[PDB]
């Protein structure tokens, strides 16, 4: 694809060796541009990471936690430095010339501070972040920071080292995920916490949307995985068909926990006729069989493993064959899982949707959400006709004042 | 694709739980059928192997050496059992219910005997091969057995435990790789050591073949990698263009040797305008961009890494982007390499062609070759007009008498 002028400016800064933060609304092509950046660089000395396993998958990277190799990051700095000096971990720190981080908004400032300090200590380079070229992107108006500790987290930009570490800031301002300017304008009002009467009426009108197709119902977006598991298990149980089982094969079952964070499929996949499923690997972009595609199980092959036949929203029916995930864990340890690329999809967490495009979703937005969380949910949908919002109330839409102040300081001095 | 009656009979035997050896000429779909078998089985308890790294890649498996975890296999049986009892190796032995082995002809009888004894000792199951369902294929009239020792190797069928371990034998007899019955008939005469006057005249006539296309020359097949390296290096040096470098990124540089056995690309790929290259990953079966495809470097992109533009024999010109190989080493350890899927291809070893289809080849066959080695070289070509044989003489075509006796015993009692 033709990069926009804005995307080309970011790639030019990266190839000049500039540390950069680039930002933009949901669906502006940040993660796409990271893939193009990675393609444009030598793989030696280039580390691709994201804040979360879900986001790391999108760019073929690892988690920032796995790269860093400092445990949780909560131990004292001396303990974290000793962990980073372990065989494998240390060579990763020493060999890293360029560190890509997607979905920065989930990285708390105290962790950024720890990583900056470990980088200097392991590399014995007394410069910001040990001299590593940082290539960071995300949207601070999307999912907020998380912490392995118990204190209220600070946004990454609050780190006293942030601006020294990413001195260049560029923006991507053209939304590609949604094609419809009416929906783009609605989403921007939500992102900024500006729900006019018109915006609220337009979101409430979606309560009547018939988002599915024959036999395909909406995926409910939920704030917590407990509620997702409960819903998917109950809806599967209620189907009359016999259960069909597909067991995953893992290279390292003792590290299942580490592999699950980054892999979107389960050790045990159970299906029935009528099961609502999400495809979680690109199979055929031309046929619309893409990551996030929704369908319904319409049959099982008679032969062999009895693989499922899935009809998708686009109208294509396909037998779904095995696939594989390889996850980079601590040091450079690699883990694999072989499984069908399907998950049950009556429900899905907002966190697990991070960075995805979806097209058949429902969400209840009648209570207080975390800063950015309602915006992330709404901005997954490719079009309004694939979105059903129940009980919408701008109480759900919250923007942390720290983030609005941050973006005002970013804007200061710019033409627009 | 519709399996033949013969292929379906092998898959039926496998799904009944029968240990089996299935055999056939070059290009009869043995490795294809193994992929279909693997697709029809649960991945848990199913181990995909081949005798060589080259052959393991074709089926997405590991080497038999890597799975077994007994070192070279030359140590005493007690030391081999202790090696197989290591953490990770032992669980692979205990968890294995079905063991697939492609290209069995390279497995010497003494190693088969050691593996059968290790299987019983580690699993504490006093039945052939520890009770593992064996799914074995190959062609004993192809590449002969190799040994990590210094004694003349025995063919795998000479093992005293061979027939007890694979009690069922089935054949695939329809060649698919070549479509031309003239060429199929010539190849069968070579396989059986039956070079009539007419067979030798037809092979000698190919000395005049123009096998290339504009700017594309034949890959010379060589018996030894020393001669391949020398030829590819000298031909690259002689080109006038500046050198372009592409350095691989390996998860584990300390196990490069382990990764190279299975990976068809180098740590350092050097290219020039005019370089003769082989694509070594499927990119587009649709457009003829398949494993083994030959082309010529016609340009380098101006942007980013300066990726190569390659024109292939089929007429397609494509920019060649990074790819990745993941290799399963001992005890479930996974290794990766990121590199462009190109190798220099003025020359290639016969051993590295094992199990491949090629389209643009030359071979000098005026020397004594190993049993099956001339047949393997000749049977890589999809068609005769992609093959140039220099100095052909039947002295090059040898069939080990042990193998002809084995196949006579296999045939005994059959209808045909
Ligand atoms: N230059 C471009 N022209 C057209 N489509 C583009 C371009 N760049 C990106 N896209 C498309 O934009 C869509 C969204 O890209 P993506 O990389 O997910 O954006 P993002 O900013 O990372 N989204 P999010 O993670 O939700 O904030 C993808 O389907 C791309 O195919
Ligand atoms: N049933 C089939 N119908 C048509 N083509 C087939 C069929 N089975 C296999 N093929 C084709 O046969 C070709 C050769 O298959 P392959 O699996 O390489 O054979 P092989 O017996 O393993 N060859 P070799 O390893 O050289 O002895 C492939 O291109 C397949 O596409
Ligand atoms: Br410049
Ligand atoms: Br609001
Ligand atoms: Br609906
Ligand atoms: Br979820
Ligand atoms: Br609600
Ligand atoms: Br001993
Ligand atoms: Br002969
Ligand atoms: Br010569
Ligand atoms: Br010769
Ligand atoms: Mg993204
Ligand atoms: Mg084969």
Author numbering:
A (entry chain A), B (entry chain B): 205 to 620
Study authors write:
Pif1 is a multifunctional helicase and DNA processing enzyme that has roles in genome stability. Pif1 proteins are monomeric enzymes and members of helicase superfamily 1 (SF1), while the 5′–3′ polarity of unwinding place them in the SF1B subgroup. The overall organization of these domains is similar in all nucleotide bound and free structures determined. hPIF1 has three structural domains, two RecA-like domains 1A (residues 206–381, blue in Figure 1) and 2A (residues 382–435) and domain 2B (residues 436–548, green in Figure 1) with a SRC Homology 3 (SH3)-like fold, in addition to the small functional domain 1B within domain 1A (residues 280–300, cyan in Figure 1).
The structures we report are of constructs from residues 206–641 (apo hPIF1) or 206–620 (the structures with nucleotide analogues bound). During ATP binding, represented by the AMP-PNP structure, R381 recognizes the γ-phosphate of ATP. R584 also shifts in position to interact with the ATP γ-phosphate, fixing the α13 helix (domain 2A) relative to the ATP-binding pocket, while Q346 from motif III coordinates the ATP γ-phosphate. Importantly, this conformational rearrangement of the 1A–2A inter-domain linker (W380 and R381) during nucleotide binding causes a significant ∼4 Å shift of the N-terminal end of the α9 helix, which in turn induces a structural rearrangement of the 2B domain.
